[PDB]
Amino acid sequence: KLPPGPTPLPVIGNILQIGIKDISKSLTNLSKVYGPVFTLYFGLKPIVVLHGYEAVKEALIDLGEEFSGRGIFPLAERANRGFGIVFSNGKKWKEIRHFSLMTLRNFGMGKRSIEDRVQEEARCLVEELRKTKASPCDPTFILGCAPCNVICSIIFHKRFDYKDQQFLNLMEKLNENIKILSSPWIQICNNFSPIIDYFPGTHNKLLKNVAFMKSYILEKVKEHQESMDMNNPQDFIDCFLMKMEKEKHNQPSEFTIESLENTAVDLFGAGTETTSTTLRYALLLLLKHPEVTAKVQEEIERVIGRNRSPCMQDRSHMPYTDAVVHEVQRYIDLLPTSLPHAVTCDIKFRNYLIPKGTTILISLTSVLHDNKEFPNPEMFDPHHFLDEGGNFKKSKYFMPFSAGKRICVGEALAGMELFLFLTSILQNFNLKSLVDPKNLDTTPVVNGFASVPPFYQLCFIPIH
Ligand code: HEM
Ligand SMILES: CCCCc1nc(Cl)c(CO)n1Cc1ccc(-c2ccccc2-c2nn[nH]n2)cc1
Ligand SMILES: CCCCc1nc(Cl)c(CO)n1Cc1ccc(-c2ccccc2-c2nn[nH]n2)cc1
Ligand SMILES: [K+]
């Protein structure tokens, strides 16, 4: 038998007993009744939900391979998304994940480190902030250009200028699809309809923008096919073509131009929004808690100084700053239910049997907001990541990137973008709120499977 759960109604399952507004709250509520493991029916489709650290750890880590599948919904087909990493499964996934992990190492693509690409961008990020001349500002756009430009660098061997139109178009389309995909209507409600697509227009728009991006990725690929030093692959494309020119006798292969571009779109998709929002939300949290902003800056002044830009080495000699970044990610809880998983085979899990294919909903919130581990888990406090001596305190419950075999491919790159961009900003700027901190409110605004910070403006005031 499958786990227990609230008895569904005929043909709509448990649809109307789940608050579509704040799903994570609804799942947590259900846990208080049915426990750490439970089933919901999303219209005859069962969904096992894991909730709390113990359940999540033993599914995702202890039974990693079994829980390594990606849950597929109709939106996967309508927006054609199962051909890269994020939404692929089986071999296709195993191979492309692995290649991408290797390639995304810090020195996986030649002499230029990932870290050097990020530092170059942190520089430019700082420079744009200057161009705002200390006037009010909605950092949404600027802060999103950086993580996007890092992906551009990783994929095409170098960055764009923030006013280059090719870049602006790329970003526009990315930003459009992300906002579209964030609608409850597309993420949830259209998924109730397994065959008929009630938003054909929207999917058409989504695909039209993917194609624009794909077509650009092809213009670059071709160019890389005539700048090809086989001994110095300078970016993700070179590395991919290399792997292609080495599987020529293993047709058919997972590595083709089709998969390269699908994978590149996955990187753009996964790489810019969440990093971008996390930065935006970090600023808002620093504005609200200026004692924190000040202590990070003490660390920056003492360890880094002004004669140079920050590097990843500094991180180990900057426990307060490390705690702050960690606390931002834990508090904001951006993907409260990760990405749905699926089991790969028939699996006994605790008391119950879960059939192969069954969708699995991991509650990251449950872990990140565990109160034994993080007392007062609803209130931003770097102290959650600090021992009584002021050293950094690791946590098994730090899973903003999820856990196990499907853990964020970008874990390290994100942490590098979070640590470098924030230290770089706080190194050269002080932050002023337009309105008084007292009435700012940084509570997450939550809409389906997405947390987001509330609109705010601020001034980037230069120091020294
Ligand atoms: C603050 C930043 C980020 C957060 C919080 C985050 C979080 C996540 C989460 C929760 C997942 C779902 C994992 C799962 O299915 O269990 C995921 C998947 C993924 N992330 Fe990120 N991520 C971030 C940044 C990035 C960046 C910069 C990249 C750049 C390469 C990236 C690439 C991916 C990829 C490729 C996947 C799909 C992994 C797979 O299914 O095999 N992420 N991320
Ligand atoms: C299939 C032929 C048209 C496709 C399409 N490509 C683009 Cl570009 C546009 C921009 O609005 N569009 C049209 C489009 C029209 C309606 C929506 C939409 C907006 C809000 C609420 C429902 C809809 C909708 N989606 N599908 N049908 N109606 C989205 C995109
Ligand atoms: C111009 C192209 C814009 C990017 C975008 N539009 C479309 Cl449609 C795809 C579908 O794969 N993509 C790529 C896409 C890939 C993965 C995700 C995903 C990755 C990690 C965490 C959440 C996201 C998510 N899924 N749905 N919305 N955002 C987002 C976008
Ligand atoms: K239409």
From Swiss-Prot:
Cofactor(s) recorded for this entry are: heme
- Gene3D superfamilies reported in the protein's UniProt record: Cytochrome P450
Q: What's the effect of swapping I332L?
A: In allele CYP2C9*3; responsible for the tolbutamide poor metabolizer phenotype
Looking at the record's lineage, which domain of life comes first?
Answer: Eukaryota
Q: Which UniProt keywords apply?
A: Endoplasmic reticulum, Heme, Iron, Lipid metabolism, Membrane, Metal-binding, Microsome, Monooxygenase, Oxidoreductase, Steroid metabolism, Sterol metabolism
Q: In which pathway does it act?
A: Lipid metabolism; arachidonate metabolism; Steroid metabolism; cholesterol metabolism; Terpene metabolism; (4R)-limonene degradation
Name the job this protein performs.
A cytochrome P450 monooxygenase involved in the metabolism of various endogenous substrates, including fatty acids and steroids. Mechanistically, uses molecular oxygen inserting one oxygen atom into a substrate, and reducing the second into a water molecule, with two electrons provided by NADPH via cytochrome P450 reductase (NADPH--hemoprotein reductase). Catalyzes the epoxidation of double bonds of polyunsaturated fatty acids (PUFA). Catalyzes the hydroxylation of carbon-hydrogen bonds.
The name of this protein is Cytochrome P450 2C9
Q: Which organism is it from?
A: Homo sapiens (Human)
